[PDB]
């Protein structure tokens, strides 16, 4: 048995359960099924420690993965591990992924950045809403500062850029991401498998 | 899309995932590469949260899965937990396990019963030592007391019913797991893409 090539073996599958749980992390995610993408996001984070040199498009797999799984904890040792919410953590990631700044990509990346502060005012946490609002800011910016000053989370401006507006256009972005992924081995031969059943 | 095929193809590949970890797990073990086995044993404990049903032969690899982790954890939040030490949760689920109870079954358990005391005396808490017997015991029961009263670690018993004789003889079985395992889909298509390159 030759132990290198073992190991070549175990990372060509790894890849491949990479792809199909970023699949399934996606589905999740669009469906609204909370307790199977946090079973997801746990398998596909413990997949990806038996890597440890990724293709560049395994890279933008991760990331997206995380971004994901940021954005899900929008609304919930974090704070002090790395000093930002959730939120703000979904826009560091998605402001460095190799993908084409877009119309799409700059919608998502707006909305994010006003529901990082929304969500701490629908929290009831109207210092932190400021906090989160000097990290980011740090066309309209003391206006949005005295918004969070009045309390004012039902204002308009936090009516357009909604929480249910940011989640549909990440979840438009989610469909493109899971038709790109639908013909990768794993979910295929796993189909092929279900079809033959039936 | 079927939400319902799409869920069956998830726990297919959930399916090949796991006897690819197994294995995975096997080797790492055999091999005493301590930090894959962590890895691998993550990721398979990970991935069985896909599964809400499983057959008798996927009980078997995931009961397989949790023996050869108490038995790696062997000498090192469990206590508090189970009440017990990680050897003596090795030997709950090896009593278990549905096989068959042949001359190595039997050679396994007895060093392991005799391992979950010396495992305690080589670490220095002899009265933990003494309430692993009487948990387990609790042919010479006074004498197996007298030399655990007396400090008497390295006597001729503790050296015949050795800790290297015990992970020699699981070691022994972990060959027979993974010849058993060695044709599973997962690890063939992938050694398969492995051989085509080389
Ligand atoms: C590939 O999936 C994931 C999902 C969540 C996380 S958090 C982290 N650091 N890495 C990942 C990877
Ligand atoms: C940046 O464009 C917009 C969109 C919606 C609203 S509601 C409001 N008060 N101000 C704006 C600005
Ligand atoms: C399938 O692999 C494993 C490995 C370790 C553990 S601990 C536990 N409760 N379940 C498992 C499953
Ligand atoms: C159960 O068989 C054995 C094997 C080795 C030894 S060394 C000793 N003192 N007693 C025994 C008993």
Not at 9 to 27: I, P, Q, T
């Amino acid at each position: 048995e030759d132990a290198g090539l073992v190991a070549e073996a175990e990372a060509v599958a790894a890849g491949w359960m990479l792809d199909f749980l970023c699949l399934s992390l996606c589905r999740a995610f669009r469906d609204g099924r909370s307790e199977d993408f946090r079973r997801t996001r746990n398998s596909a984070e413990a997949i990806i420690h038996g890597l440890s040199s990724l293709t560049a498009c395994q890279l933008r797999t991760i990331y997206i993965c995380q971004f994901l799984t940021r954005i899900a904890a929008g609304k919930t040792q974090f704070e002090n591990d790395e000093r930002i919410t959730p939120l703000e953590s979904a826009l560091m990631i998605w402001g460095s992924i190799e993908k084409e700044h877009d119309k799409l990509h700059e919608e998502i990346q707006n909305l994010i950045k006003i529901q990082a502060i929304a969500v701490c005012m629908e929290n009831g946490n109207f210092k932190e809403a400021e906090e989160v609002f000097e990290r980011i800011f740090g066309p309209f910016k003391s206006k949005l500062l005295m918004i969070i000053s009045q309390k004012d989370t039902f204002h308009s401006f936090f009516q357009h850029f909604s929480y249910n507006h940011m989640m549909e256009k990440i979840k438009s972005y989610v469909n493109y991401v899971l038709s790109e992924k639908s013909s990768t081995f794993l979910m295929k031969a796993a189909a092929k498998v279900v079809e033959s059943k039936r």
